Structure formats: C-alpha cells, structure tokens
C-alpha cells in the first residue's frame, strides 16, 4: 500500500495473507468471508504469462496478523471463475479458496460481508470512498534498501471510486463492467494506491444502512503504483456474486 497508514489493532479482522507453503513467500492478499471460505484474485493463483498455476497443496494462508494473535491454515481446494480472462484484460479476476477446516473467530479474526444488490447500488458511486488493506510494497521503487518499502504493520488507505469514463480514459486496456477503478486524481492533492503484494486483497466499504463492512472489490491490477493519472482496478464483487454463491452452494456442504 502506497501513502497509507498503519492499521489499528483489529481494524481489518477479515484480512488474509496468501503464502507459498515451502519455501515461504508472500504472494497476495485475500479476505475471510466465512469460517471456511477465503476470497482472492484469480491471477494470484493462475497466471500463465508469469508461469503461475498453483494448486491447494502449494499454498498456506495466514489470518489475524497485525504486525498467538495469528493463524496458519492449509487449503482444501481452489476455485477460479470459469470465465476469468487471463489472456486479455484480467476480466472476472476472482477466486475462492476453501480452508482445510474451519477457523475459530476471535477479536482479530472475523468475516467481512458480501454486498447485496441494494448495498452495491447505493455505494458504488463516483467519489464514494472505500478502503484497501495489504502487506504489499510501500512504494513502486526503493531508494536506499529493499526493506524500506516493506511494511512491518498491515497498511490501510481510503480511496474514492472513479467515474467510469475517467477509468476507461486512463488506460489502453479494455475495461469491462466486472471492473471498477479507484484512487485520487492529480488535481485532488491526496494520494494512495495498492502495490506489489496487495493484489487479491479487499476493497471494503462501511454501510450507512446497517454499519457492517462489505467487500465491494478485490485488488486486481494497475499500472505502476500511485502514478498521477493512473488508477487501481478492482474486481466488481457483487457483479460476480452468483458465481461465488454457486461455488459455496456446490462445494460448501
């Protein structure tokens, strides 16, 4: 996360980290949506142009991490959207990971809500801010050392959703309805973005109707990090929820 701040303890208890099992390597962010299901970006698990094609047995997740607070879980199975377009523009960039066994909730481990139609309709508006969290790089590039851009605490940044014409205008990539973009404009002064390692992590919004946090996005792709006139692109969670529900209904008994 670029231009964010240290998360407060328990601020993002649905936060999940996706790791290569052995040897160890932080791969992506993710989010906890029930005691057994984790949501992430498809490209975190399957991306042939970088020779990426992980199975359940290649991976571990970490949950409840801020900085015995923290839980390590194995995966039973991975499910990637059947119409995820890795060849072109990362359309439908979404995947589910089923934990080997359910996790117990605590003060530091608690699931985020998935939006329904009404919440998505109300809140997915230009200028409305959501929140992105992750263990990704603090800047696109480092000046003194490799570790000056790796954070010691979970990072948080609030970013406004951007007008669709501005999103589309900002890139040559064909963007679809299954993507939205977020971030400040050059003239707005304020800054912030996801960066390397934040992919797959959540873009959340707090409902004014019921004061619950809802995951509206999944960190998907960008062009560099925190560049003037560029925006982060996020998978539109609600637009793909029937698929999420189909997977949980089929494989979640």
């Amino acid at each position: 996360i670029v231009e964010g701040s240290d998360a407060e303890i328990g601020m993002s208890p649905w936060q999940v980290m996706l790791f290569r099992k052995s040897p160890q390597e932080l791969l992506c962010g993710a989010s906890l949506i029930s005691d057994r299901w984790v949501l992430t970006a498809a490209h975190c698990l399957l991306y042939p142009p970088w020779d990426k094609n992980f199975t359940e047995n290649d991976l571990l997740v970490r949950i409840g991490k801020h900085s015995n607070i923290e839980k390590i879980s194995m995966l039973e199975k991975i499910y990637i959207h059947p119409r995820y377009n890795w060849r072109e523009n990362l359309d439908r960039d979404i995947a589910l990971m089923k934990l080997k066994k359910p996790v117990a909730f605590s003060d530091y481990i608690h699931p985020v809500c998935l939006p329904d139609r009404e919440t998505a309709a109300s809140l997915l508006q230009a200028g409305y801010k959501g929140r992105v969290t992750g263990w990704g790089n603090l800047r696109e590039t480092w000046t003194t050392n490799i570790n000056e851009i790796q954070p010691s605490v979970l990072q948080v940044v609030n970013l406004p959703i951007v007008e669709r014409p501005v999103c589309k205008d900002s890139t040559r990539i064909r963007i679809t309805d299954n993507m939205f973009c977020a971030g400040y404009k050059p003239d707005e002064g304020k800054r912030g973005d996801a960066c390397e390692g934040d992919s797959g992590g959540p873009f959340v919004m707090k409902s004014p109707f019921n004061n619950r946090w809802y995951q509206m996005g999944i960190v998907s792709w960008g062009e560099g990090c925190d560049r003037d006139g560029k925006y982060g692109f996020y998978t539109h969670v609600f637009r793909l929820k029937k698929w999420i529900q189909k997977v949980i209904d089929q494989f979640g008994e």
Binding site: G10, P13, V112, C113, Q125, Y128, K129, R131, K206, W213
Partner: peptide
C-alpha cells in the same frame, strides 16, 4: 449474514476507527 462485517474491537464495542468517518462522509456529501 450472521455477524459478518461487525468488528469485535470496533462496532461491537461502539468504538470508531480513526478514518471510517471519512468513508461515511463521502457517501453523504
């Protein structure tokens, strides 16, 4: 939904985090 989206250290204790108001203000302005 169960208790989804309600944080044990925040909503459940009637505490606000340091920047959530900024999010809600953007919806209302």
């Amino acid at each position: 939904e169960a208790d989804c989206g309600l944080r044990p250290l925040f909503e459940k204790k009637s505490l606000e985090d340091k920047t959530e108001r900024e999010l809600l203000e953007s919806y209302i302005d």
